[PDB]
Amino acid sequence: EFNILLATDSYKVTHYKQYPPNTSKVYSYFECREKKYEETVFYGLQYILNKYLKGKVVTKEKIQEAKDVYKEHFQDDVFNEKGWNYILEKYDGHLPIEIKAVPEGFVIPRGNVLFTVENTDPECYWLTNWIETILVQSWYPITVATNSREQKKILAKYLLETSGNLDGLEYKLHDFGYRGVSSQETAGIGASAHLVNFKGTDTVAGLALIKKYYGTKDPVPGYSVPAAEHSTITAWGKDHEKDAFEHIVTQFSSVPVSVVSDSYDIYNACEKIWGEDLRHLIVSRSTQAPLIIRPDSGNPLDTVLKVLEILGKKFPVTENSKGYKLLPPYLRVIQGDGVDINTLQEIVEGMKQKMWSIENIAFGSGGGLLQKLTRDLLNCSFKCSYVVTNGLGINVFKDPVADPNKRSKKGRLSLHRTPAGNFVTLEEGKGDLEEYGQDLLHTVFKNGKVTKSYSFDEIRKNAQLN
Amino acid sequence: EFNILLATDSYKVTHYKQYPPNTSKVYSYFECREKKYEETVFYGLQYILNKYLKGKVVTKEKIQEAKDVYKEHFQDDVFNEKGWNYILEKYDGHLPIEIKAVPEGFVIPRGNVLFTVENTDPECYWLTNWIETILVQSWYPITVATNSREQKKILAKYLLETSGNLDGLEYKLHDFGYRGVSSQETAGIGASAHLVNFKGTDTVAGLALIKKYYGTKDPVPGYSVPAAEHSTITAWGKDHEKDAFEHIVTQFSSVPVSVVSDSYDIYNACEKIWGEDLRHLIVSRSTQAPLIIRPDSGNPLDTVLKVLEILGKKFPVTENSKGYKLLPPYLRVIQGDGVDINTLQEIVEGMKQKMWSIENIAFGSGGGLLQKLTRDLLNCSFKCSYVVTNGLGINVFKDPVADPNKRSKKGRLSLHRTPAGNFVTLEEGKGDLEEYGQDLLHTVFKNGKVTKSYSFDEIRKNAQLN
Ligand SMILES: O=P(O)(O)OC[C@H]1O[C@H](OP(=O)(O)OP(=O)(O)O)[C@H](O)[C@@H]1O
Ligand SMILES: O=P(O)(O)OC[C@H]1O[C@H](OP(=O)(O)OP(=O)(O)O)[C@H](O)[C@@H]1O
């Protein structure tokens, strides 16, 4: 069972002895500090609130467990047993904390407050930053959701330019990241963050998380199709790639099927096997059930172009109203190797220059989508901005001399729409002047209860492209 | 409840209809493919076997749950209900799988078999590659352990050169990665992997994982010390940094204490506050209770060197037996900002050139230690190498034309010691010839049971530096 007393950075166990005496309030905030990612999707907090923070999170046994561990960990009894016991006795183990957050799915420019944390009981001044560690981990679903949306922007731009519409955009970037992430829990979190923007996923874990923590009107938030891997092709033996190909497309004749084609020779597979030997099984396919040829090696741009070049000469290629080449509806290509935001841009641009419609191509991304991201990409940061000491509120901040970018905000914070319809974070409690509209930060957690939640449908709506 | 039927890549649900008819055996292996990072620490499989793979992992409820999810996920009844029911009825939900692996903590050159997977029942040919996704996630603890060890190699080289010994090496790289990782589960896995090489950690989750899945003779595998953060300094107010400093060091006067000193001006804090105003509280401290000054901004190397020069002028610096400058034992520095394998090397080399002993410095790493790593850093891959179809064993492999590095191994595999005492992976069942010694892989999993285990003490011993 999870223990919140053991879910913090070790040194935070010693911080209750470090704050100024007579401190009754610690007030902190999360932002993606200003530095290619000018706006961020806020997503993932509701998961953390429900799974880890809500209800009775302190028990008699959990306090003793923590006390025993930290005694050995520090070689000293520094642990605040008395502080945690107070929470157990007075609030039945419910956290006297208030969390206010911008609605999930909201797209917010960098350098704005996204959520705030404060203690609601003066005895628990130390608790605000105790939970920094668990809350800051929201950086990940935020960053995955943001990076995924930015890739959608690129896909949208090129799809619209090369085809004149956005049909099937929500299926142009497929999550292949399950094996390439660091854990089962990460897989589910990351997969769900991608599903804010897209509907194609192989990371099943993401579906259960959305169902449990967010909810959607549809039975499932994400979908997939039958697909081959190298084991299902190579198990037939090198001399029998054609038989493997034939068997798989015949098995999945009435649904879309993706078939990895680079086991031995991708260019041979497209020209000779797909383009000649088994052509008759491809041209007879439905528009609802295309063959999706999947290269999986070589230079991503060069390989996609060569594959399209080969297929264009073996199958009846048309030219759409924008003047771009289009494969027949029963045949498509998915690039699922070496795909990240940079190579995605590189491929669609190379395709456009060679006059190929983005209709022809879909993308798959694993590590690039769910793993090759850090807390530093969006400068995700949690800092104390306000304390009450001796009954007086003081605006607090860091401002390192050698890095002005690390300067933090002062005082009590609020988020507002500007008259031109942008966003502004007001500092030093200036939001109380009512010069702007309503504070966009809403109480989502208070004293052990989740007070406002959003469905996954609402989140998708909020995170739409312009 | 974790459901193994929902813990695979979506397309693997469709693979039982893709293998050649009358396939009785699927045999696959894991390696870190060849072409820094020339050898890998094998760590983390035991965790996966115990948490996810062992015992009764199939129930009737879990089969129905998966059936209903995949029905909506594929918009089709492609899920292998009968295959999974067979396992439940015949084996009481235990996986008919055998896994052979190198001992954990073992240091193996790239391009060698690390573990193999095969089905023990002909009916369950499809199960071998079903569990690929779960098992491939071992890339992460392997990569953390390996990258951590490579950093220890760098630290050892410079500590030995500047001081003449390796005292306290195991405390020179501290885990700060809790908030910087993608999930709670990743935090535990990654922290445990770092603890294979070092003993300092702030990521508490790592302790419980080790004690549950590996075990150590000591009460805890990892330790920490009291330390300040920006909130516990800045809360005092801009004009009261000295008061913050004084309070914290006097509260923790008998243990080591780390104090972040860059809230407003790092060079002012070192020269005027530590070096003048509070010098009397530093020079009185025990050798077992040093002040550890923590810069946290600016250029990592330039800041460390400037901090050291400042302290050198305010404090009684000595010269060690190797001719390098050494701060008094009550005074140390920790650089915990922007630390990864590359910048660690830069700092210790830069220190050496300015004649500063590595005794003076410790490092902390967060994202660089536990997050900024991917599956392709060590080329971690899981591939089928051998199948039995129509009673005949067939050597299986991929060899893509445009990437010869992606070529996989053929047939039944075994790991051996060479006459010169190195490692060799023999292919095509050639290990049966016994021209080398016995196969060095052990059966670690068979038919739902963990059959071989290693304590965390064994692993640490296996993974030590030469
Ligand atoms: O973007 P990524 O994180 O790489 O994930 C996508 C890739 O992962 C799989 O490769 P596989 O597991 O066979 O690894 P390998 O290609 O390195 O052998 C799959 O064949 C995709 O090409
Ligand atoms: O190696 P990393 O992943 O950066 O983690 C380590 C850093 O994290 C903490 O800063 P904080 O959480 O305040 O982040 P910030 O300095 O970017 O605000 C700490 O002060 C370290 O500098």
For ligand 1, atom 7, which residue shows the shortest CA distance? A337
DSSP class of residue B270 equals I
Pair (B35, B63) in one structural domain? yes
Q: Residues of B forming the annotated binding site for beta-nicotinamide D-ribonucleotide?
A: 202, 294-296, 336-337, 367, 375
User: What CA–CA distance (Å, rounded) separates B295 from B304?
Assistant: 8
Pair (B76, B173) in one structural domain? no
Read off the CATH number of the domain in which B175 is found: 3.20.20.70
- The contacts of residue B421 (CB under 8 Å, 6+ apart) are none
Pair (B442, B466) in one structural domain? no
Amino acid at site A225: V
User: What CA–CA distance (Å, rounded) separates A316 from A275?
Assistant: 11
Residue of A nearest to B4 (CA): A205
> Residue A18 is encoded by which pair of tokens?
């470090």
Q: Is the CB of B6 less than 8 angstroms away from the CB of A372? A: no
Number of compact structural domains in chain A: 2
For ligand 1, atom 17, which residue shows the shortest CA distance? B381
Residue-by-residue DSSP string for B3-41: -GGGSSBGGGGGGGGTSPTTEEEEEEEEEE------EEE
Residues of A in contact with B227 (CB under 8 A): 11, 14
Pair (A215, A313) in one structural domain? yes
Three state DSSP letters for B129-165: HHCHHHHHCCHHHHHHHHHHHHHHHHHHHHHHHHHCC
Pair (A365, A281) in one structural domain? yes
Pairing, β A291-294 against β B107-109: unpaired
Residue (of B67, B48, B52) closest to B1 by Cα position: B52
* Closest ligand to residue B340's CA: 2
The distance of A418 to chain B (nearest Cα, Å) reads 30
Pair (A246, A341) in one structural domain? yes
User: What CA–CA distance (Å, rounded) separates B2 from B258?
Assistant: 40
Pair (B147, B287) in one structural domain? yes
- The contacts of residue B300 (CB under 8 Å, 6+ apart) are B335, B337, B338, B339, B343, B346, B347
* Closest ligand to residue A263's CA: 1
For ligand 2, atom 20, which residue shows the shortest CA distance? B296
Mutate which of B13, B26, B204 to disrupt the A interface (most A C-beta within 10 Å)? Answer: B204
Residues of A in contact with B129 (CB under 8 A): 229, 231
- The contacts of residue A163 (CB under 8 Å, 6+ apart) are A320, A322, A324, A357, A358, A359
CA A318 to chain centroid, in Å, comes to 37
For ligand 1, atom 6, which residue shows the shortest CA distance? A366
Shortest-distance atom of ligand 2 to CA A383 = 13
The distance of B230 to chain A (nearest Cα, Å) reads 7
Sign of the CA dihedral B338, B342, B348, B351?
Answer: negative
User: What CA–CA distance (Å, rounded) separates B152 from B157?
Assistant: 8
Query: What stretch of H or E contains B189?
Result: helix B184-194
Who among A137, A234, A382 is closest to B397 (CB)?
Answer: A234
* Closest ligand to residue B376's CA: 1
- Do residues B99 and B91 lie in contact, with contact meaning Cβ atoms separated by under 8 Å? no
Mutate to test the pocket of ligand 1, among B132, B376, B397, B408 (most ligand atoms within 8 A of CB): B376
Mutate which of B9, B144, B246, B267 to disrupt the A interface (most A C-beta within 10 Å)? Answer: B9
Residue (of B197, B116, B174, B191) closest to B386 by Cα position: B116
Residues of A in contact with B389 (CB under 8 A): 235
> Residue B67 is encoded by which pair of tokens?
């059936």
- Do residues A346 and A300 lie in contact, with contact meaning Cβ atoms separated by under 8 Å? yes
* Alpha-carbon distances of A316 from A244, A287, A291, A306, rounded to whole Å: 25, 14, 15, 17
User: What CA–CA distance (Å, rounded) separates B449 from A110?
Assistant: 51
B130 lines ligand 2 (CB under 6 A): no
Q: Is the CB of A176 less than 8 angstroms away from the CB of B137? A: no
* Alpha-carbon distances of A306 from A295, A351, B101, rounded to whole Å: 10, 11, 40
Who among A18, A190, A251 is closest to B232 (CB)?
Answer: A18
> Residue A456 is encoded by which pair of tokens?
């996954």
The distance of A320 to chain B (nearest Cα, Å) reads 31
Pair (A117, A144) in one structural domain? no
* Closest ligand to residue A297's CA: 1
Q: Is the CB of B400 less than 8 angstroms away from the CB of A266? A: yes
Residue of B nearest to A66 (CA): B204
Amino acid at site A32: C
- The contacts of residue A347 (CB under 8 Å, 6+ apart) are A300, A301, A304, A335, A339, A361, A363
> Residue B60 is encoded by which pair of tokens?
């009737």
Phi, then psi, of A37 in degrees rounded to 5: -105, 85
Domain, as residue range, for A118:
1-136+375-453
Q: Which residues line ligand 1 (CB under 6 A)?
A: A 176, 179-180, 296, 336-337, 365-368; B 375, 379, 381, 406
User: What CA–CA distance (Å, rounded) separates B414 from B440?
Assistant: 7
User: What CA–CA distance (Å, rounded) separates B466 from A375?
Assistant: 35
Three state DSSP letters for chain A: CCCHHHCCEHHHHHHHHCCCCCEEEEEEEEEECCCCCCEEECCCHHHHHHHHHCCCCCCHHHHHHHHHHHHHHHCCCCCCHHHHHHHHHHHCCCCCEEEEECCCCCEEECCCEEEEEEECCHHHCCHHHHCHHHHHCCHHHHHHHHHHHHHHHHHHHHHHHHHCCCCCHHHCEEECCHHHCCCHHHHHHHHHHHCCCCCEECECHHHHHHHHHCCCCCCCCCECCCECCHHHHHCCCHHHHHHHHHHHHHHCCCCCEEEECCCCCHHHHHHHHHHHHCHHHCCCCCCCCCEEEECCCCCHHHHHHHHHHHHHHHCCCEECCCCCEECCCCEEEEECCCCCHHHHHHHHHHHHHCCECHHHEEEEECHHHHCCCCCCCCCEEEEEEEEEECCEEEECCCCCCCCHHHCCCCCCCEEEECCCCCEEEECCCHHHHCCCCCCCCEEEEECCEECCCCCHHHHHHHCCCC
Residues in chain B, total: 466
Who among A185, A248, A303 is closest to B184 (CB)?
Answer: A185
Q: Residues of A forming the annotated binding site for diphosphate?
A: 179, 230, 294
* Closest ligand to residue B408's CA: 1
Q: Locate tokens 């704050």: which residue?
A: A19
Q: What is the resolution of this structure in A?
A: 2.2
Residues of B in contact with A184 (CB under 8 A): 2, 7, 52, 134, 137, 185
For ligand 2, atom 3, which residue shows the shortest CA distance? B367
Three-state DSSP class for residue B294: strand
- Do residues A137 and A30 lie in contact, with contact meaning Cβ atoms separated by under 8 Å? no
Residue (of A151, A119, A100, A103) closest to A417 by Cα position: A103
Pair (B246, B361) in one structural domain? yes
Who among B134, B266, B396 is closest to A234 (CB)?
Answer: B396
Q: Is the CB of A182 less than 8 angstroms away from the CB of B180? A: no
Helix axes A139-163 and A341-353, enclosed angle (nearest 10):
0
Mutate which of A2, A14, A252, A297 to disrupt the B interface (most B C-beta within 10 Å)? Answer: A14
Who among A226, A238, A406 is closest to B14 (CB)?
Answer: A226
Residues of B in contact with A296 (CB under 8 A): 400
User: What CA–CA distance (Å, rounded) separates A439 from A418?
Assistant: 11
- Do residues B24 and B389 lie in contact, with contact meaning Cβ atoms separated by under 8 Å? yes
Who among B226, B267, B408 is closest to A78 (CB)?
Answer: B226
Pair (A119, A129) in one structural domain? yes
The count of other CB atoms within 10 Å of the CB of residue A415 is 24
User: Experimental method for this entry?
Assistant: X-ray
CA of A375 to the centre of ligand 2 (A): 9
Pair (A172, A305) in one structural domain? yes
Shortest-distance atom of ligand 1 to CA B380 = 17
The count of other CB atoms within 10 Å of the CB of residue A263 is 27
User: What CA–CA distance (Å, rounded) separates A25 from B340?
Assistant: 36
* Angle subtended at Cα A354 by Cα A352 and Cα A360, rounded to the nearest 5 degrees: 60
Instruction: Give the A:B interface size as CB pairs under 8 Å.
Output: 339
User: What CA–CA distance (Å, rounded) separates B103 from B390?
Assistant: 34
For ligand 2, atom 6, which residue shows the shortest CA distance? B366
Phi, then psi, of B414 in degrees rounded to 5: -150, 150
Residue (of A438, A392, A449) closest to A416 by Cα position: A438
Residues of B in contact with A25 (CB under 8 A): none
Dihedral class, residue B22 (left if φ above 0, else alpha if ψ from -120 to 50, else beta): left
Pair (A200, A248) in one structural domain? yes
